Symmetry: D2
Subunit: 268 residues, 4 copies
């Protein structure tokens, strides 16, 4: 019946009802998965948001920069899903770069402390979460992280693009470790999605020049994509994550699946 029937899956990264991870969680539940959610900092808000998912799911606190949160995560997950049960899936949908590393602020003016925080949250934490959770993952399991194609430089996204380049490299090493558990590790490289932060940026939150550049980027994406690209609809991305969480891509690991309308395959 459901693509993910019986699977136990941890989903990080919900902060609003427009988070990509909110849609990942909704579709996974539609497909029969039993979820455990993790949230950062504003847990009352996240609980109120995820009350709207089609099924109940326990919410655990996880700041990926907090060593104590990471050290206790597996035991808290096991308590939530029951002793003797393990996870079949993990979704990393976590990203952050201080404002100095994006938008109008010149690329050269981002101090390393800011870049380092952004790489910690956006790239290193993919390894951190796999380290914490692989000991409680079943063979045949799947770890999926969210990516944005960084193979070519862009306007505005600056150091966040560098962080995604690092994340793609981290994923290839996580795949080596995860394989020892019979677990796959892959990224979904999505086209642009109008999350609250992205809408705020297009609205000029990081400077008019950066907002204009990002609006132009979105327009070219739908133009290039042979099947089009709808930045207001995260469901195609959520479905692709669920495909990697399923048993139907069993020989793919260390890899990147592009849920971008095909835009990255076309020049114009």
């Amino acid at each position: 019946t459901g693509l993910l029937d019986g699977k136990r899956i941890l989903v990080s990264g919900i902060i609003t009802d427009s988070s990509i991870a909110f849609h990942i969680a909704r579709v996974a539940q539609e497909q029969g998965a039993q979820l455990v959610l993790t949230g950062f900092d504003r847990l009352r808000l996240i609980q109120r948001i995820t009350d709207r998912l089609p099924a109940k799911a326990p919410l655990l606190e996880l700041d990926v920069q907090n060593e104590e949160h990471l050290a206790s995560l597996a035991g808290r997950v096991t308590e939530a899903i029951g002793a003797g049960n393990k996870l079949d899936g993990v979704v990393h949908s976590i990203g952050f770069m201080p404002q100095t590393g994006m938008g109008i602020n010149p690329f050269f003016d981002a101090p390393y402390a800011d870049v380092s925080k952004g790489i910690h949250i956006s790239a290193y934490s993919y390894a951190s979460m796999a380290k914490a959770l692989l000991p409680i993952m079943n063979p045949g399991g799947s770890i999926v992280g969210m990516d944005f194609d960084p193979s070519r430089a862009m306007p505005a996204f600056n150091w966040m693009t560098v962080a995604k380049s690092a994340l793609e490299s981290v994923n290839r090493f996580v795949a080596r470790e995860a394989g020892k558990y019979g677990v796959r590790s892959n990224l979904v490289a999505a086209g642009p999605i109008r999350t609250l932060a992205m809408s705020a940026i297009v609205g000029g939150a990081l400077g008019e020049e950066a907002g204009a550049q990002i609006q132009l980027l979105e327009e070219g994406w739908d133009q290039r994509a042979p099947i089009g690209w709808n930045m207001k609809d995260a469901t195609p991305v959520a479905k692709t994550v669920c495909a990697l969480l399923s048993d139907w891509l069993p020989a793919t690991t260390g890899d990147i699946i592009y849920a971008d309308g095909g835009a990255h395959t076309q020049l114009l």
Copy 2:
């Protein structure tokens, strides 16, 4: 229930019960698809082989070098599935290179007539089949072709690797045309599979040097793959094709999905 329930899917490329397309067809039927099969030249043999699939499927003759076969294909498919019905999926699992273009024969000694025949069958025909079948494909449909990663030169596969480089390029253009129909086009890049031809080559059919090189290639593949690689098991490849035929990769087109154990993501 089934991943492909209700979908009508054409599968080319069955010649033995170890053909990758035989396993594609079996898994697709297991997942509820209604198939139409195409075969080249030895139709009594192919019918006897496909009698072992879990469900009946009409068999149509298709030599992709035959313009008349291509011009009549859509009408013959429609007759097989019924007027007013269209295809949801197409599988291209067709490849050939004359012996002069592979194995012990020096790369420089393949005459162009032989290379051209191999590129016709292995690359151009992906465009030929899409041209013939897109007019009878439903929106939301999917065209999938079989690939072998040609981004780096290898021993022995010589001009067939060139043909796959061409195929990957053709796929990106087919995606442009298919998008106008609401149809996706993608390739699955598989690791090595012990088909009858591959077993015969490892056995020395194309020279001892080529057999030795191919055996070494297979060994390195399983070694590199973080989840391993079983050349005797086509099912992981067949499942990946079915994933692309399903509705669960709806924003991927013009693209390549690697069903190779992750080997291409690792150096050693």
Copy 3:
């Protein structure tokens, strides 16, 4: 003194004074190389054109589809440069695709006979020329071919882009063969250059839609290139070919050097 002082270098592909190979030949002579030229079909025209190069150079006929021309080429070169002398460099600057394979004519409507001729001239002939000339190349020599980045599909260039994908694959195999002679093989992927044919296409020779698409492609190239791109100036491309012909890239082979203003490294 000269970058190429004392080197003997064969340059194919001159047909007008705006051919990329005309500028390759001029710069190579400026840098002290002694050239042998090859031309296709219109030899009186090519001789009149190359009379304007800074130094004399013998002109040999070479139709790369003519097996007899290829079989006699080495002996004719040796006669031109003197017994006991060998070539240090070879430049392949040859490309062709029938009109049916480019521009307004739909991608699906190019007959295979036309595509096959274009792949013969544009891709297979890189292997043909290396086969003919490696027996008369010195260790430390260099073979260079002209490329146009085909990693993503474009409007209009259709089957010529497929042919470049094939050429890049051929180059990686030629490098394997050339290495046995101590010879390197590489491609230069150039940005768009306003040759006579390209000007004619922008002028609508292959349909208004194709001319418009190509003009848009040129505009985006200069916009993306961090150092800009001047389609009216082939000299930066010619210099890059000369760099690969020199001794200053001695550990690069099977590879692609991008002389494109950096455009392919940037999204926008």
Copy 4:
């Protein structure tokens, strides 16, 4: 005469007479460049080492993690080369990862503080140096950094490979900034070179497993490279850096030139 005659070029990264930057500096001086050198921490040692270069060159202290060193660098360079003179070239040959991020120590056990230091020195500092030096670079200038192909995960190099993935991304953004000055930015991806640190690692300094894996990596490199690979000879790498510092790759930026014997173009 000399490839770099009259050019003023800053070279970082000398620590021993087997440093890649020592050979870069030697070849650049052989080709007529006037150098300024930067060294980290052990300046008496570095001065004694660089006394063996064919020409005198002033040595400036530069710890790329020291904001004060970076803020004063341009003024100290100008003092060394004379008011009214600017640099034509910059060589970044700087890399470091704490031991916890390489070798026998499990990938997951590297603490982020260590990874962050390694990314600071190995990747961010490429942007730091360009920021400091672009204001005193001439149009037509060239910035070159040293890379090791990180597109596929490897044994042992672990987080240093992640750092190179980040560096490649940084280079594409530096190219955008440098283009405004008429300056190119590129990396040379070298094959393995037996520096003192690399010899020490093969000797087991980071665990026997890591030493064995690295020795196997070197062996496969020479085997794959169509022209071979000599890990005891940095001169082919130094020459390639000088090519990018010259005027002979004037349309290449944001890019990576592979000085690796062609190994990355071949599977086996």
